[PDB]
Design a protein around this motif. Structure first.
Motif: not given
Lengths: 74, 159, 437, 177, 50
Positions: C188-203
């Motif tokens: 639904a949204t995305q926070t800074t921690k969610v962005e960091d998790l995406a960066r870690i996962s999303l290659r």
RNA sequence: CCUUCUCAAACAUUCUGUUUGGUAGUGAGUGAUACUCUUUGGAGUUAACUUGAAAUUGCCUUAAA
RNA sequence: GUUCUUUGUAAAGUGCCUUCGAAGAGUCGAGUUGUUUGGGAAUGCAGCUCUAAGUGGGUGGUUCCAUCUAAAGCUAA
RNA sequence: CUUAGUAACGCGAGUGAAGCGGCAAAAGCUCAAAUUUGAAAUCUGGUACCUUCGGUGCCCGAGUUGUAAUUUGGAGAGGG
């Protein structure tokens, strides 16, 4: 592993009921008396002497400690 | 002397309570071989020329009763006090207490067998009862509890 | 646009036609082509906006392109914070794969571990699992073929982070491969921690896409069902929507209410998508009736002008439920009263309600007047096997949902009285449920 | 199933209840003869898993043997010799004494028509199974013979007598190798 | 809570099937002229004994 | 440890329609304001609801022995 | 082959979805005293003080992995 | 048969195996353990008949301290 299986808590319940109803063996009575007065350092030696296996002695000591905790704390 | 688990039996119900329990149980005698055979023959004869509710009977099998207990289906359990292999029944009272199922110890296995058309019944228990006797069943359960758990609260003590 | 304007396989097209959705949504229209191309994509699409099918269809397309046997690899892995979302996603996947020949399964916390392990050993090409049990299945289960992870999608990353599975997510990322894995996610949204998790996962460089009184009743656990039945009976001729925390419970309640000779409509994920839409349309256009729906089903679904909104079971997303009333009041011609059932041990939710600072009212009912159908329900359950099975399944699902609730401080299995819940469900003897108490 | 409870209880042989039962039953048995008929086994949990069936044709015997050939094997032979018409199936321990050790032995009457018509148990009626305890074909007899799979029994896998014939026989063919 | 779930079988909520099998066997025996119905036995015995 | 006062007439005899008579109860507790009454002290009526058959005191002999 | 019977909401097999899911104690083992082998880890068998757990136990090679599930029984070649 | 008169033991005299490999033949199963409980449905024996290495009806007894369905991890069981 394909057949190790787990307790399912039915064996646990039956074993707990059997332990409660049967009571304590004379060597078990001596072990608990030593634990409540001397401690593990003295009880484990007797457990090993009676059983002969260090791991079995430690398991028996842990079981006796758990029984004592469940009994005196209620 | 004997350990606390032994001598727990022989502290049976009083005369009046035992008589009332047996009177109630006598209203649910399982059909004997002859009765069931004649009923089946009558049903076959009716079918030959061309919806009953669930039957009510007392559950008594040692294995069957033990299976009924630990599932909370059983309501009353009767335990014989003269079982030669005592180990078969030593655990029944404690198991019933742990499960909370009301239980009682009655004198003589032959008495239990008589009410179930058997020579000797180790145990006798009731699972479901008719609505008419539901109040009677509850009253008997309360009386048994009062006369056994409170009156003989020390049955599990004093070797 | 429409699904017919894409390189979709014949079985996938047939399944989509069976679903009944032929017009692509904005989020779907924007995400399907990039997903098919394999480019990693993340977005803040709202829950229930069709993103589930949006990222499920590319997974099925990839599976049909590879055409690998079920024993070969594990295919696709889906991570969802809640068990209800996992069940809904599994139902959607089964509906889409009806024509397809690939295998699918679930791994849900509190379920039969042995069955899940056996299913994983047999080989699952489309796995939907919560992180908590997914980690256990990855770590302490031999024979798993996760080495062939082709795609990975994360749904509602914010909720996963809030619950406290961020460490679990990091462990899963570390364990899982990254050579040929295409990573995506939606929330639904995305926070800074969610962005960091995406960066870690999303290659690679991921593609970014963007698009009233709080009435409550304090009732006993045993009497909650009877009170709800009485409320429905005396509120007939109105429109009422009931929110629950389990599809099985919704189905059982709908069947029981129908058997008690009162029309009622059900709306759960397990129901077929075409049937789901037909029932929703019928309820919307009827102007009279009662709808029993799950939290996830109505999370993003349209809310017609309904007179009542009843939260019979604890909400799956407490923040969303708290914030719903503000928009619900504006979105209806007649402000629909909000009703919630709170156990005496569940009074902690009043703290959150006060924190919301929205107006609240405490409704009261007399214990003397009640449906008094306990005996009839018990007789029906003891006499009918199908009704007994449905009631048992609903009770099991409700207990599983309660045990998995994020708000542990407010909701706890230990504080619950199993006997009272079983009596409410009509079981004098509470059936056993494998709950890690 | 009540059998699980009995099996679990029997493990704690040193418990107060089982300790008292041991003395009571050994005192009761000492009064009777060395070998006597038993109406029913005192350890149903073990008997049932040892093939015991509560039906006509199954006989349970109690035999007393002095404490120190395995004691179980000696007891089986003693009960079989007296009950020639019966066939020994298995045996198990029940009680012990400072001067005697007690074992309960189960025997099946092949003559009974119930056993003969019972497929699960009619095999015992074969004459090859006559006096199994005498030849050490019982559980205790096989154990005493060291017949098991593993390097632990390689030297005694197939008895201690056939090996002598195998090693002491010079094999010769028509065309010498 | 109990120990094992053991979902209940249909036979518990359904009339006994063994009783139905026995009834069908008795019906077959009666049809084959093997078992005299109880009413027929009563009728025959009423004529007899006199 | 016994079981509970399971219908009687006149007309009409379309085989059931009209009229009459026969029904004296576990207790306790809570409780919505009208009827009379005799004048005083309350006597009988009047909505509604909880209950384990719950509860602390209103001034004849064969179910023989 | 020839046939007379079939029987009844009777029985069995496969794939899929859901819920469950139980394994042998005076037994292993240690200790000790004798026997057995040419058997170096007397393994195996025999008397007896002692005597355990179920994600456990046995058998092995390496700081982890490999195989099996003993204390019940039948089987023609 | 081969492994092999090898490993191993005794280190003398001598004793002395087994995996793998090829051949002959290949069949796997039967109990215990979780409730049929909406119906001990199991079976021994006596009797009257018949189509008699046995079958049916009746009677009695054994059995509920467990005889009838299924299952031995190769799993297995209740439901759609």
């Amino acid at each position: 592993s394909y057949k190790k299986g787990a307790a399912s808590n039915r064996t646990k319940f039956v074993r707990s009921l059997v332990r409660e109803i049967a009571g304590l063996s004379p060597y078990e009575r001596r072990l608990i008396d030593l634990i409540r007065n001397s401690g593990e350092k003295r009880a484990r030696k007797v457990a090993k002497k009676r059983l002969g296996s260090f791991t079995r002695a430690k398991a028996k000591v842990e079981e006796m400690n758990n029984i004592i905790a469940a009994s005196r704390r209620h | 002397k004997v350990p606390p688990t032994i001598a727990q039996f022989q502290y049976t119900l009083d005369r009046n309570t035992a008589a009332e329990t047996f009177k109630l149980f006598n209203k649910y005698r399982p059909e004997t071989a002859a009765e069931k055979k004649e009923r089946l023959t009558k049903e076959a004869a009716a079918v030959a020329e061309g919806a009953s509710p669930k039957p009510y009977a007392v559950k008594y099998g040692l294995n069957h009763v033990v299976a009924l207990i630990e599932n909370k289906k059983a309501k009353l359990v009767l335990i014989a006090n003269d079982v030669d292999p005592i180990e078969l029944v030593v655990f029944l009272p404690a198991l019933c207490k742990k499960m909370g199922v009301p239980y009682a110890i009655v004198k003589g296995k032959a008495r239990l067998g008589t009410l179930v058309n058997q020579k000797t019944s180790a145990v006798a228990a009731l699972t479901e009862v008719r609505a008419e006797d539901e109040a009677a069943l509850a009253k008997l359960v309360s009386t048994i509890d009062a006369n056994f758990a409170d009156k003989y609260d020390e049955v599990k003590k004093h070797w | 646009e429409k699904f017919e304007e894409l390189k979709l396989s014949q079985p996938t097209l047939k399944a989509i036609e069976k679903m009944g959705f032929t017009t692509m949504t904005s989020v779907q229209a924007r995400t399907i082509p990039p997903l098919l191309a394999g480019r990693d994509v993340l977005g803040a699409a709202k829950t229930g906006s069709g993103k589930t099918l949006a990222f499920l269809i590319p997974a099925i397309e990839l599976l049909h392109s590879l055409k690998f046997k079920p024993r070969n690899g594990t295919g696709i892995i889906v991570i969802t914070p809640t068990r209800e979302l996992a069940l809904q996603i599994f139902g959607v996947a089964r509906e889409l794969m009806e024509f397809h020949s690939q295998t699918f399964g679930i791994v849900i916390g509190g379920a039969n571990r042995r069955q899940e392990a056996e299913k994983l050993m047999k080989g699952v090409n489309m796995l939907i699992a919560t992180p908590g049990r997914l980690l256990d299945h990855l770590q302490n289960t031999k024979g798993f073929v996760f080495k062939n992870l082709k795609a990975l999608i994360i749904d509602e990353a914010d909720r996963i982070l809030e619950i406290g599975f961020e460490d679990e997510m990091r462990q899963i990322i570390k364990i899982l491969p990254n050579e040929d894995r295409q990573s995506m996610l939606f929330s639904a949204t995305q926070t800074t921690k969610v962005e960091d998790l995406a960066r870690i996962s999303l290659r690679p460089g991921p593609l970014f896409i963007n698009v009233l009184e709080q009435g409550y009743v304090v009732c006993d656990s045993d009497k909650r069902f009877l009170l709800l039945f009485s409320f429905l009976k005396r509120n007939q001729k109105k429109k009422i929507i009931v929110f629950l925390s389990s599809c099985n419970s919704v189905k059982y309640y709908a069947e029981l209410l129908n058997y008690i000779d009162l029309p009622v409509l059900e709306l759960h994920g397990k129901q077929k998508q075409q049937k789901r839409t037909n029932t929703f349309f019928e309820f919307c256009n009827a102007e009279r009736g009662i709808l029993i729906c799950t939290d996830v089903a109505a999370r993003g679904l349209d809310i017609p002008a309904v007179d009542w909104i009843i939260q019979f079971d604890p909400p799956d997303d407490p923040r969303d439920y708290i914030h719903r009333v503000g928009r619900t009041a504006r979105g209806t011609k007649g402000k629909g009263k909000s009703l919630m059932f709170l156990t005496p041990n569940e009074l902690g939710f009043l703290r959150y309600l006060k924190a919301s600072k929205v107006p609240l009212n405490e409704y009261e009912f007399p214990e003397n007047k009640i449906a008094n159908v306990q005996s009839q329900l018990e007789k029906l359950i003891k006499s009918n096997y199908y009704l007994h099975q449905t009631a048992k399944d609903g009770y099991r699902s409700y207990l599983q949902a309660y045990a998995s609730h994020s708000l542990k401080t407010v909701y706890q299995i230990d504080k619950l009285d199993l006997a009272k819940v079983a009596k409410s469900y009509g079981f004098p003897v509470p059936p056993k449920v494998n709950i890690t108490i | 199933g009540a059998y699980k409870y009995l099996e679990e209880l029997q493990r704690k042989k040193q418990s107060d209840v089982l300790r008292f039962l041991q003395r009571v039953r050994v005192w009761e048995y000492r009064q009777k003869n060395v070998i006597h008929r038993a109406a029913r086994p005192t350890r149903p949990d073990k008997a049932r898993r040892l093939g015991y069936k509560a039906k006509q044709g199954f006989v349970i015997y109690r035999v007393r043997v002095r404490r120190g050939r395995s004691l179980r094997a000696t007891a089986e032979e003693r009960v079989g010799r007296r009950a020639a018409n019966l066939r020994v199936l298995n045996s198990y321990w029940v009680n012990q004494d400072s001067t005697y050790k007690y074992f309960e032995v189960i025997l099946v009457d092949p003559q009974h028509k119930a056993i003969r018509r019972d497929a699960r148990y009619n095999w015992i009626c074969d004459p090859v199974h006559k006096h199994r305890e005498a030849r050490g074909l019982t559980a205790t007899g096989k154990k005493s013979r060291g017949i098991n799979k593993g390097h632990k029994f390689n030297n005694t896998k197939a008895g201690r007598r056939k090996t002598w014939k195998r090693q002491n026989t010079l094999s010769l063919w028509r065309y010498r190798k | 809570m109990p120990l094992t779930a053991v979902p209940e079988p249909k036979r518990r909520f359904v009339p006994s099937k063994n009783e139905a099998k026995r009834v069908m066997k008795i019906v077959r025996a009666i049809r084959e002229g093997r078992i005299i119905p109880p009413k027929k036995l009563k009728e025959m015995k009423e004529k007899e004994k006199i």
